């Protein structure tokens, strides 16, 4: 009484409503530090003028 396990399972059945169906989520967090930027886009480099 008043002493519960903090976690609980998801009920994932194929017949579940889309609201209750499982969804995989990846969150990308971008950030700048006291270092050169090491994650860059595919954007091609060019000669310097």
């Amino acid at each position, epitope marked *: 009484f008043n*002493c*519960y*396990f*903090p*976690l*609980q*399972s998801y009920g994932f059945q194929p017949t579940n409503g889309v609201g209750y169906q499982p969804y995989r989520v990846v969150v990308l967090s971008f950030e700048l530090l006291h270092a050169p930027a090491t994650v860059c886009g595919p954007k091609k480099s060019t000669n310097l003028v």
Partner: nanobody
Amino acid sequence: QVQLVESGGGLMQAGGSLRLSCAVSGRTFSTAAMGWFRQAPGKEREFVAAIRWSGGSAYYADSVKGRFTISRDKAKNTVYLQMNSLKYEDTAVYYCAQTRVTRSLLSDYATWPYDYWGQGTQVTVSS
């Protein structure tokens, strides 16, 4: 997949004691909680006691509370039911049960459908 094998049932006089074991085999890393249920001839199945595999916390029905102790051995993959002060009402077939399901409220395990069942072991309480 898991299989459950009860043992340690039989005859005993009212006011005496008995110890049921149930051995889990198969995918045992999947056990969330275990339960004991009983069913006298001609009456419906009834929840007895549940234990959470991690933490070893126990929930009991009111009819057995203070007389029965549920306990587990993680290492030996076995749940125990220590039945003391046996009574008329205790006579029944006892089933152990396993669920892969984590419920926050331990009480849930009284009413929640379990995943696998043993064949059962008979208990009988003499007059």
